[PDB]
Design a protein around this ligand. Structure first.
Ligand SMILES: Nc1nc(=O)c2ncn([C@H]3C[C@H](O)[C@@H](CO)O3)c2[nH]1
Ligand SMILES: [Zn+2]
Ligand SMILES: [Zn+2]
Lengths: 180, 189
């Protein structure tokens, strides 16, 4: 781009970031995130997606997917895209800015060490994961050197963590990606 | 864009990325990354800069700076920008892809935990830092929860780590940023 770092997004993902969605139940939020996984694989991306929602309402704020290969950008993990697009939409770099509602990142899989970092600086107050890190390793993705007790590390910084939500459904999509 | 991840580059950073530049010595590369720190603080960004070089020729591939506040993006650390812009120019996610020259990330401070992870994924083979984690913490920033022995973890993944290079000057700049970052107007800022 020359005068910007610009990561374009495939049509289904631009649509996800510009369509109204309020999904109140945690599993509804995760189900939608898993639909973005499948759309992403069809759009040449990795089998990972994530979306930022208002924690209480379930209003979708932004979504992201793994666009590393087609985007030529190793930082383009789903969590980075979802967090950055939510910040852009809300016009702030910090999702816990006074007066903003609490934000939650709903992710198809436990975060790698980069995304662990990004979650901490983002301002989100909640993280909900579907596939576990052993599930992601089992299809050839590396979580990298996260610290021991990364979940506790998040909790100590005010981010409550849920894991294993619709895990089996997320794993079916991981195993599919791997098989092809 | 709500249609894309888009972090615009200030003009001095477009300039840095446009102009061919070869810096052979570690100190030369770092001296230049420290010019960008000072330019970035003047262009409303954080006191941090980084650049990707060809390790064995010193050719500059891309530079980045902290644009967290001006770019409304908490992901927009120097290292993230430099890595990603380098990737974009060379048209690969992997700086270690076949046929590419080995790359080195030269950075004004030790990476926070996010950037540490970015460095592992990026395909650079060397990381060279100026200010230490304690330096940046001393002006109130926080590197976050890096794993124990993060430097050894890099070397275990084949990424050579050097720290402390022009640390005194990089520390001078952090203090200068610190001294200017308050709300009470002060003319000499
Ligand atoms: N190396 C490096 N480059 C950057 O651009 C940068 N920006 C911030 N930091 C450190 C301190 C903050 O608490 C935390 C910022 O949220 O991480 C950085 N470290
Ligand atoms: Zn990640
Ligand atoms: Zn960082």
């Amino acid at each position: 781009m020359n005068d910007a770092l610009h990561i374009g997004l495939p049509p289904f993902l631009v649509q996800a970031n510009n369509e109204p969605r309020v999904l109140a139940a945690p599993e509804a939020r995760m189900g939608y995130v898993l639909e973005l996984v499948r759309a992403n694989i069809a759009a040449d991306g990795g089998p990972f997606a994530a979306a930022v929602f208002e924690r209480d309402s379930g209003l979708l704020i932004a979504a992201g997917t793994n666009r590393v290969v087609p985007g030529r950008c190793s930082a383009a993990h789903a969590e980075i895209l979802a967090l950055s697009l939510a910040q852009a939409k809300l016009d702030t770099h910090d999702l816990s800015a006074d007066g903003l509602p609490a934000c939650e990142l709903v992710t198809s899989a436990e975060p790698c060490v980069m995304c662990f970092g990004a979650v901490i600086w983002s301002g989100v107050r909640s993280l909900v994961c579907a596939a576990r890190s052993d599930d992601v390793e089992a299809i050839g993705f590396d979580e990298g050197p996260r610290p021991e007790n990364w979940m506790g590390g998040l909790e100590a910084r005010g981010i409550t963590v849920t894991t294993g939500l619709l895990r089996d459904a997320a794993c079916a999509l991981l195993r599919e990606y791997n098989a092809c």
